[model samples]
Target: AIVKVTDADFDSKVESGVQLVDFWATWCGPCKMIAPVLEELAADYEGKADILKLDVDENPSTAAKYEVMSIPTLIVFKDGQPVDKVVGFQPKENLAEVLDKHL
Candidate 1:
């Protein structure tokens, strides 16, 4: 399942292991472009890792907290801390490579 992250669950969700948090908005073109990629990653890494989405528009506070300055920002967290960040759209294979490192 693709976890819908919010300010309420951000800490709890990211504080564990490797997490892929997509910061996006409904109206963003690039954000829309990466939706399927994120969805696939969510299913691909379901139980082994946490793949989550946070709508920057709906969850502005969470976006601000993370200093998300761009749409489709993928934040990788490990051991309750952010370890890597990717901005804009990227291929599934590219994301997999990053996840593979933490896995």
Candidate 2:
């Protein structure tokens, strides 16, 4: 489940939990490529972590806040602080491994 995020809600939603934010756009191919993998991760980590999806087009302010330089950027937050991030299209297993290490 991709939870929609906006500029106004970004802090409360992302900074409030153990969140994994997917920064992406609708037409970005690499972003599309990683969508399913993120979905899988959401399912795997359900109830244990927060999996959020933020659209760059719809919420550029949030994107700028994180200084996102690319599509499909993954940022992990622990207790309102960003701790880790990944860019580009990566494999599901690889991402899952990262989540496993952190969450």
Candidate 3:
């Protein structure tokens, strides 16, 4: 399952594992296009990694802290640090490659 993250729980959630956070807004068309891809990833990467979704509009603090200037920005975190990022809509294969590098 894609865990819904908010400012309150963001730290605890992404602080420890191989985490992929999708920073997006409801109004972004590209963000909508990648929603299903993330869902599939949540299941496919199920025991190996964590997939999280954070709405930029609803979680401005977290978004700003991460310097997320665009919607649908995917950030990959390892050991609580950002290691990689992909902006805009990306295919599942591309996203998987990002995660695979960390795994």
Candidate 4:
């Protein structure tokens, strides 16, 4: 499942394990295309990893911190630090590979 993450609680949530944060905004092709892939990954990795959604438009400061100038900035964080990043729409298997490698 996906939980809404904001600037206030962003640090606390990503501080523990392999976390996937989606810097999302209102629809823009690939951004919308990646939404379902994320949801599927969430279920596929339920307890192993985290699926987070951070709305860049609503939390510009957090987005700015991550250098999220584009849509669908999927950042993989481990122990609260960024380890990998993906931009735009990614294949389901492509994302799974990234998610599993972190764990």
TM per candidate comes to: 0.92, 0.92, 0.97, 0.95
Instruction: Say which candidate scores most in TM-score.
Output: 3
lDDT of 3 by residue, 17-80 (tens): 8999999888999999999999998888988999999999989999999899988899999989
Model 3 misplaced stretches (Cα beyond 4 Å)? none
Q: How big is the positional error of residue 102 in model 3, measured in Å on the Cα after superposition?
A: 0.4
Candidate 4 per-residue C-alpha lDDT over 1-103 given as tens digits, one digit per residue, 9 for 90 to 100: 7999999999999998899999988866787888888899899998899999998888999999988888888999999999999988899899999988989
Per-residue lDDT of candidate 1, residues 1-103 (tens digit)? 7879888888888888888888988889998898988888888887778888898898899888879998889989898888889988899999999998887
Candidate 2 regions exceeding 4 Å error are none
Better by TM-score, candidate 4 or 1: 4
Assess candidate 2 and give its TM-score to the true structure. Answer: 0.92
lDDT of each: 0.87, 0.86, 0.93, 0.90
Query: How far does residue 28 in candidate 2 sit from its true spot (Å)?
Result: 0.3
Q: How large is the C-alpha RMSD of every model relative to the true structure?
A: 1.2, 1.1, 0.7, 0.9
Clashes of each: 0, 0, 0, 0
By lDDT, rank the candidates, best first.
3, 4, 1, 2
Error of 2 at 22 (Å): 0.5
As for TM-score, the candidate ahead, 1 or 2, is 2
Which scores higher on lDDT, 1 or 4? 4
